[PDB]
């Protein structure tokens, strides 16, 4: 018997998060992400990910100053952004500036080093990002700024200025919302490279390249793409029926694990709506709500994460290529606390196939 | 019910390859890799692996051809490889230079060229492999020769010299040895980001990162460090007992599937013994020899084809640090074979895990 997509199989155990079945509430670390995304910082999360608790204030002091002080990237890395191609897909650019930082990290290779490995790819993360984001717009790189946390950080990098407090929250209940959750494709993928004991940067290059793909992180990106087709929410319905018929997959809808809404929405649809009411996205706002409707009147299928993200992103101004890498930036708590938890109990990732090819045959 | 490993569980069909259990036989689409190791070349063998069928000698004229246009890099390539640190491990220069070979080509998402972009990809890994290895000995880059077949060319880049049959032989036979292997860690990396619809270079990249590890690739390269440490065939016996209490692994040993033997090692030891009789290695003999019968006296454990690998990779005059690159070479072949199949018969990889940590609580000052 195949488990093909290992679809209903149980794999490990894990202590990081988990989809309570009675409220449908994901929960990092036992509290849910809905009230993390109320009520703490990027900051926060991240240390509640990895540590297993929420930080003192002393704890929190001495992990904002080393977040701040490991932003900056070296003259290698400008040398290898401004010599990338600017036409290959930004994701390429997270994909082959991690394993380069990976090749420097005179720590690579040593396991016991993880914390302090997975908090520099943490914080360089946005760096690179909003220098790839800029120059392909022709703009010069904006330095880390240690006066700004997470949030506010990344933004005055893409765009010179912090935005409007509105912004600024929408973006980091974002980074909230996709920090973690459980052994999807990317942080699978981390998990078996991790099995081998391959070190962390290898593990998180190869989930970066999980992620890229459409039937993953790439639908983000795929959604805004679709707005943009979609035009007005007068050709929504036609849109929609249309690519229904030929049994094409909506982007944004479907998921493995919920069946009755992805618990991260309602969160993300809110930061959707304040950042539509301060910024002028009613347009999007319609087409949202009616390609939702239509969605659940045909299928039966609700929207996932990736749906209220991809409007929200392009309001707040990144450019539709940099959704992907904007998830890479948050994802990477989710990841590297998964390549921690595995390497610690660890055994190789390594499964059967059934045969359907040629038979035994003689050399001819 | 807790799958850890996915130890025992069947994740798909292939088509590409199985061991017939009674004869403990390996297959590449069929036909026995032992006799394809004795009779083929490696460019024979990627063919069969990609196209389910042997090259008649016209198909394999023209593929060979393709093969030798295609292992060229650029100057930026080449300026790339300088830049990196010159004591990084030599995985991160091959993971690093194949991200960057994506990133350059214009169709690295499109599916549809599949085909080609293995075909590029399993023509330059010897040319990147060979330029870092060379590199790390304070040696400029030998160009690729386009009237040097696979195996020779390799070799010749590497040492500036074809050298004798026995090792051009030995070498060619562990390329045809190391080319596929079912859904081992590093393929099944590969069809994990496929399964997202990433593409061929995302994928190759993360199967370059799993290989990299000590129970993976990294078994070939750890296997050598080990014989070296142990010095003398005399020694080998305590220094095993000493790593068995401590519950060690023992690299070079120990497989997921094999419980009586690894297909593949007696064909590599007997190329083992051809190039230590060439190459002054009876010491190497001898220490694989106490060692593998120290093993089955403690454990029952046999062998996997990394342990004969190793010294003769070291006697082929290779650097130890380069072992598990030389690895890449050939298994780039079997990962982009299980890529296409992934990509053609896909389903998104998503398992479930079970929660042992904090039940729900209550954010403070709700």
Not at 12 to 18: G, L, P, R
Not at 255 to 276: I, Q, W
Not at 282 to 300: F, H, K, N, P
Not at 340 to 364: F, K, W
């Amino acid at each position: 018997d195949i488990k093909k997509g290992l679809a209903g199989v149980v794999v490990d155990t894990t202590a990081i998060s988990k989809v309570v079945p009675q409220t449908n509430s994901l929960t990092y670390r036992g509290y849910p992400v809905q009230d993390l995304a109320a009520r703490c910082s990027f900051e926060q999360v991240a240390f509640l990910l990895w540590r297993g608790e929420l930080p003192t204030d002393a704890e929190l002091a001495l992990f904002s100053q080393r977040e701040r002080a490991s932003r900056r990237v070296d003259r290698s890395m400008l040398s290898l952004l401004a010599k990338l191609p600017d036409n290959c897909h930004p994701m390429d650019v997270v994909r082959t500036a991690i394993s380069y930082l990976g090749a420097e990290d005179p720590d690579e290779d040593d396991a016991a080093a993880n914390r302090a490995k997975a908090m520099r790819m943490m914080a360089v993360l946005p760096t690179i990002v909003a220098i790839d984001m800029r120059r392909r717009r022709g703009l010069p790189p904006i330095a880390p700024h240690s006066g700004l946390g997470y949030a506010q950080n990344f933004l005055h990098m893409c765009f010179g200025e912090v935005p409007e407090t509105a912004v600024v929250s929408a973006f980091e209940q974002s980074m909230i919302l996709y920090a973690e959750h459980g052994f999807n494709a990317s942080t699978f993928a981390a998990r078996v490279v991790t099995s081998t004991q391959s070190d962390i940067y290898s593990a998180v290059t190869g989930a970066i390249g999980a992620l890229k793909g459409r039937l993953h992180g790439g639908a983000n990106e795929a959604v805004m793409h679709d707005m943009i087709e979609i035009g007005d929410p007068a050709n929504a319905r036609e849109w929609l029926r249309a690519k229904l018929a030929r049994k094409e997959k909506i982007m944004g809808f479907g998921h493995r694990v919920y069946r009755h809404g992805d618990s991260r929405v309602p969160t993300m649809k809110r930061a959707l709506e304040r950042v539509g009411t301060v910024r002028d996205g009613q347009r999007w706002l319609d087409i949202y709500q009616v390609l939702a409707a239509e969605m659940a009147s045909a299928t039966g299928i609700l929207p996932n994460l990736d749906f209220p993200t991809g409007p929200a992103y392009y309001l707040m101004g990144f450019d539709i290529a940099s959704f992907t890498p904007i998830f890479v930036m948050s994802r990477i708590t989710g990841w590297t606390a998964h390549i921690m938890e595995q390497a610690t109990a660890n055994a190789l990732i390594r499964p059967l196939s059934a045969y359907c090819g040629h038979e035994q045959r003689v050399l001819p």
